[PDB]
């Protein structure tokens, strides 16, 4: 599962979106020989590039920015198109946070990569003297976290003027707080280890 990530290095395609579901699938359960399977196999190979794949793959995610929002706020009211047609809402998708499932599955993969409370992985994930390149994933995740809070704080300051809030804006809030649900503990199973 890992070298098909390591040979990718910066492509958010659709095959990554299945080979990380397989990673959720094979890392679910809290198993330890699946961890000791990976550790020696990465340290004695000494091929950096999987960690730059995880460096580049998590910052190409979509944010709650408010210039790509109020245009589809108007485009969602247009239900009936002429010339004997209907709106292809599934083909249009949601243009605001279209990368939700991708970073939903990646953060649970990094969750269950270290849920087993094994601290050589936690010293590994930030400090690699055995390789020549440190990648330091945790401060990248916390810069992701502060990009999230300065996104949704201005999302709140955008509609603080209106009291009663309606449907699709709060559904856009819902599928953002649903990935917040997992990025909020994806750095807690890096720190609850002894």
């Amino acid at each position: 599962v890992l070298q098909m990530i390591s040979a990718c290095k910066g492509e958010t395609g659709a095959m990554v979106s299945s080979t990380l579901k397989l990673g959720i699938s094979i890392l679910n359960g809290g198993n330890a020989e699946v961890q000791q399977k990976m550790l020696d196999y990465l340290k004695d190979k000494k091929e950096v590039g999987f960690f730059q794949s995880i460096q580049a793959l998590m910052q190409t995610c979509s944010v709650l920015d408010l210039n790509a929002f109020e245009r589809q706020n108007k485009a969602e009211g247009l239900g009936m198109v002429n010339e004997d047609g209907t709106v292809i809402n599934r083909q249009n998708g949601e243009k605001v946070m279209a990368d939700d499932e991708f970073t939903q599955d990646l953060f649970r993969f990094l969750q269950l990569l270290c849920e087993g409370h094994n601290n050589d992985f936690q010293n590994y994930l930030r400090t690699q003297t055995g390789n020549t390149t440190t990648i330091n994933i945790i401060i990248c995740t916390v810069d992701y976290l502060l990009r999230l809070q300065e996104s949704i704080s201005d999302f709140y300051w955008y509609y603080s003027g209106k009291d009663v809030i309606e449907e699709q804006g709060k559904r856009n809030f819902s599928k953002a707080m649903s990935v917040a649900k997992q990025v909020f503990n994806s750095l807690t199973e890096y720190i609850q280890g002894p």
Binding site: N67, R71, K74, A75, L78, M80, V81, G85, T86, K95
Partner: protein
């Protein structure tokens, strides 16, 4: 010297075996002109005695057989294998009585029955060499060989080779079992996928491979074969599962006739019954929303909500219930070996538990094969939306287009040569006079034509060496955009490269980019902002980039190109404004991305006035030495650039009911746009008179035609505006009336060119300020 004697000399047969691969390297990639010529060299009975010869060596045994397929019947297999997965059936009388199971719950034998898929012929031509030589030939096609004699020779070799293999010969035909069974199966696979054999001679090959289950000696599959011969078996069983998938979509295409022929009279019985049922008032329009409100592809989904909202009676719900569960039982689920669904499922694991493979193609091939017949339902679900149905009175129009699509994708895998320019463009012009090009816009989405016309464009775009082909490739596309509109967004993600190579004479690939933003607002406000600074990057390049079209021609030097950046604004204006309503997002992003570029404007206001450019421009258009001294004119491009510049600032402004509201920034672009461009520079150009024809008529590419006059009148209208009257009696003091009485003088292309102005612009200026 005999060919029977190269089995012992070790030197002349390594040379002669490689003479044949050069003989099929020249007769490959759809090249048919030397395929005629090499038939005189190596001909029919030299092939046909030698293939049924048996004492031949192995490499030459395989090489002559691959030569005999590459020289004759590989130009006819590409056109059928490239379109086997696209499904178009006519509703002829032969498509109304087909069952999925043979009548007489047992599975039918695959590959047989009756198929009605629209596929063109191979168009075989008889080879002759005593014919007269022309002159450049229009079309040269494959030689004709009688296949009626070869249809049994394609079977008898296999039929006695397997009783040899059951006899387990130590030194068999060709030296080994690999050279026994690799060439004749690759022979039979091409004719089997090309569709030459009927339905009772492929009865025999299904008796051949498996005589235990396929009954209406030893089989082929239960012997031990090497790993290089049985990939063509995977190819032919892939073909068998492909037409097994064809039978399902043919049966459901019959049922698509059946169910609407069932219910479209129940529908008019319903409308005639409830047309006079006035016993309900609040519910009558609620049931009439079924009648007149929903779209015609929405009532079909409203129709079938019977699972576990349905005004349809209870005698019409169960035939498709018996149909689709029969389709489930035809698939892998039994819906509560004996068939080929259990034949080859236990074949891949049988071959895998035997020995470790050495090959990266067989472990991909049969691992793509068994998942096919396992998730047959999922493979049907991804093959059915690319299937269409055409009324059977259009077959004589559509087989021409299918042959043309077999031609364009026979030519896309050859590189463009000296006389490859005309056969491209008369084929895509034969598309135009077909009258299926505008009847249905969406069967071409299933055929996949709209990206093969730009994959041939990126070959010649990567200097350019083919000036003929680019304005003809975009010629197809510019009419392809506006036949319908869900074809538009199949082109929208292509815009990162559609205008990447736009910066020619005739038409350039930016015309289709301008056609990608027309006639709808949701195709207009959904532009990403990163794909728009690349236009003003070219505009800022041409703001001081000179023209390579002028100094190489010999025309005088101007430090910037007016006509090079003139149609960079026409795409921008059609991207901003579509159909009587302004965009509220993109109009905010275009102006500040425009005005921080200092070079994107003209050289006058970069600082002389606006009339100081046009007063020199008119006089250098009047002087012959200052102008060009054939259609490109520096005296008309200078004003055409300004006309493309100013009107976009005119109709990039937001609307008037956003002025009185609490918009904190919609007034500000208005303020900076009235501040950078002055107002007293408008009255001079609206005050400049005409050189009106009277008794002569002057040049339209060298004089002030009202195409540019039609910009400042709308630039006056709503972004500057009029409120009081001391300017109202001055905008029409000289601005309209000395030219409108010039229209009165001869009330002649210039006269109607200025009545375009008079009946497009000035009358909505004074109707809105009539109070």
């Amino acid at each position: 010297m005999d060919i029977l004697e190269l089995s012992e000399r070790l030197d002349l047969q390594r040379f002669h075996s490689h003479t044949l691969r050069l003989y099929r390297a020249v007769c490959a990639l759809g090249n048919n002109r030397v395929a005629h010529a090499l038939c005189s060299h190596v001909d029919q009975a030299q092939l046909l005695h030698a293939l049924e010869d048996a004492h031949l060596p192995g490499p030459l045994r395989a090489g002559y057989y691959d030569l005999l397929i590459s020289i004759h019947l590989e130009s006819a297999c590409r056109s059928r294998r490239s379109m086997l997965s696209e499904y178009i059936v006519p509703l002829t009388p032969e498509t109304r009585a087909i069952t999925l199971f043979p009548p007489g719950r047992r599975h039918g034998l695959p590959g047989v029955g009756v198929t009605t898929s629209l596929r063109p012929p191979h168009h075989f031509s008889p080879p002759c060499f005593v014919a007269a030589l022309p002159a450049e030939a229009p079309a040269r096609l494959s030689p004709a060989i009688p296949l009626e004699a070869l249809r049994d020779k394609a079977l008898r070799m296999l039929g006695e080779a397997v009783r040899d293999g059951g006899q387990h010969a130590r030194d068999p035909v060709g030296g080994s079992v690999e050279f026994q069974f690799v060439p004749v199966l690759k022979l039979v696979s091409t004719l089997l996928v090309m569709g030459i054999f009927g339905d009772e001679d492929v009865k025999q090959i299904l008796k051949m491979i498996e005589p235990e289950v396929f009954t209406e000696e030893e089989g082929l599959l239960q012997m031990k074969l090497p790993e290089s011969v049985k990939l063509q078996m995977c190819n032919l069983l892939e073909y068998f599962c492909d037409q097994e998938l064809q039978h399902r979509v043919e049966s459901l295409a019959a049922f698509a006739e059946r169910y609407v022929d069932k219910l479209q009279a129940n529908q008019r019985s319903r409308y005639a019954l409830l047309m006079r049922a006035f016993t309900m008032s609040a519910a009558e329009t609620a049931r009439r929303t079924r009648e007149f409100r929903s779209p015609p592809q929405e009532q079909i989904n409203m129709l079938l909500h019977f699972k576990d909202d349905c005004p349809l009676p209870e005698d019409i719900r169960q035939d498709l219930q018996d149909f689709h569960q029969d389709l489930l039982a035809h698939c892998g689920i039994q819906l509560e070996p004996q068939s080929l669904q259990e034949l080859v499922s236990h074949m891949v694991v049988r071959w895998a538990q035997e020995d470790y493979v050495q090959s990266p193609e067989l472990v991909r091939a049969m691992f793509s094969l068994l998942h096919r017949q396992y998730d047959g339902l999922g493979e049907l679900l991804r093959a059915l939306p690319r299937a269409y149905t055409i009324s059977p009175s259009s077959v004589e129009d559509t087989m021409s287009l299918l042959e043309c699509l077999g031609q364009i994708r026979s030519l896309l895998i050859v590189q463009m040569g000296p006389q490859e320019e005309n056969l491209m463009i008369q084929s895509i012009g034969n598309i135009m006079n077909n009258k299926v090009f505008y009847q249905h816009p969406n069967l071409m989405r299933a055929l996949g034509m709209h990206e093969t016309v730009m994959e041939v464009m990126v070959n010649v775009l990567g200097e350019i060496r083919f000036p003929k082909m680019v304005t003809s490739c975009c010629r197809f596309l510019c009419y392809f955009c506006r036949i319908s509109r869900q074809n538009q967004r199949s082109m929208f993600d292509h815009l990162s490269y559609l205008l990447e190579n736009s910066g020619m004479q005739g038409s350039t690939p930016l015309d289709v980019a301008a056609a990608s933003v027309i006639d709808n607002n949701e195709l207009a406000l959904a532009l990403q902002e990163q794909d728009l600074e690349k236009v003003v990057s070219y505009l800022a390049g041409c703001g001081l980039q000179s023209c390579p079209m002028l100094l190489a021609k010999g025309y005088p030097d101007i430090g910037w190109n007016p006509c090079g950046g003139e149609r960079y604004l026409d795409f921008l204006r059609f991207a901003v404004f579509v159909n009587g309503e302004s965009v509220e997002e993109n109009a905010n992003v275009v102006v500040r991305l425009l005005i921080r570029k200092p070079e994107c404007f003209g050289p006058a206001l970069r600082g002389s006035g606006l009339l100081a450019a046009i007063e020199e421009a008119i006089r250098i258009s009047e002087d012959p030495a200052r102008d060009g001294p054939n259609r490109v004119h520096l005296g008309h491009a200078i004003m055409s650039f300004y006309a493309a510049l100013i009107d976009l600032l005119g109709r990039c402004a937001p609307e008037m009911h956003l002025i009185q509201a609490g918009k904190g920034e919609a007034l500000r672009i208005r303020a900076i746009l009235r501040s950078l461009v002055p107002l007293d520079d408008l009255v001079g150009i609206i005050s400049l008179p005409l050189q009106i024809p009277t008794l002569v008529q002057p040049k339209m590419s060298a004089s002030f035609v009202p195409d540019h006059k039609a910009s400042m009148v709308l630039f006056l209208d709503r972004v500057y505006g009029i409120e009081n009257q001391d300017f109202l009696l001055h905008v029409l003091d000289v601005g309209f009336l000395p030219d409108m009485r010039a229209a009165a003088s001869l009330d002649t292309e210039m006269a109607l060119a200025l009545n375009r102005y008079l009946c497009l612009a000035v009358l909505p200026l004074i109707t809105k300020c009539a109070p």
